[PDB]
Structure 1
Amino acid sequence: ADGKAIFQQKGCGSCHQANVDTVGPSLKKIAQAYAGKEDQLIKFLKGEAPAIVDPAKEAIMKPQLTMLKGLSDAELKALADFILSHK
């Protein structure tokens, strides 16, 4: 197989340049992130491993939402109003 060709043909270059971050991280940045985890890169490409380069910050915020699960509709609205009041 020709990895460089496949990368180009599937459009991956549009967001991934060799050394420069654009819409996506540079290939150097991705390569360095997977140092000692190289099998995991193949798993990532197969949809079988989580993103490790720029992981969604949902991981920090999502558990915080469990604290709001019992709130009433009035309490949720009040909370949202408080947030919105800033500005």
Structure 2
Amino acid sequence: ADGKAIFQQKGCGSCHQANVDTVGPSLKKIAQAYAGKEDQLIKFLKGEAPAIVDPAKEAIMKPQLTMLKGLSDAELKALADFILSH
């Protein structure tokens, strides 16, 4: 699986730039928060774990997770590993 392609095509980049906080936190910031926590990042992406980066705006991000409900666990992992690479 291609985490970069999934990220692109689900429209995530609109709120998540690599190195700058905008509507959502940067990928760099998310990657740092979830360093060594890949399993938890996958859980988050499933709606299974709490926001740990910007809880003030948790409810804004939550609905975006609905996009990901067609992905396998391997694809979710690939998406997580793309995020973590930043």
Structure 1 unaligned blocks of 5 or more: none
1:47-80 per-position Cα deviation (integer Å, ceiling 9, x unaligned): 1000000113999999999999999999999999
User: Could you tell me the TM-score, scaled by structure 2's length?
Assistant: 0.63
Q: Tell me the C-alpha RMSD between the 2 structures.
A: 18.5
Higher relative contact order (CA 8 A, sep 6+): 2
**Alpha-carbon spacing, 1:83–1:15, altered in 2? closer, same or farther (3 Å):** closer
**Structure 2: gaps of 5 or more residues:** none
Normalized per residue, the structure richer in helix is: 2
| Whole-angstrom CA distance in 1 between matches of 2:5 and 2:73 | 54
Instruction: Give the direction of change, closer, same or farther, for the CA distance of 1:37–1:9 in structure 2 (3 Å limit).
Output: same
Secondary structure of 1:35's counterpart equals coil
Structure number with greater Rg is 1
Aligned residues: 86
Percent identity reads 100
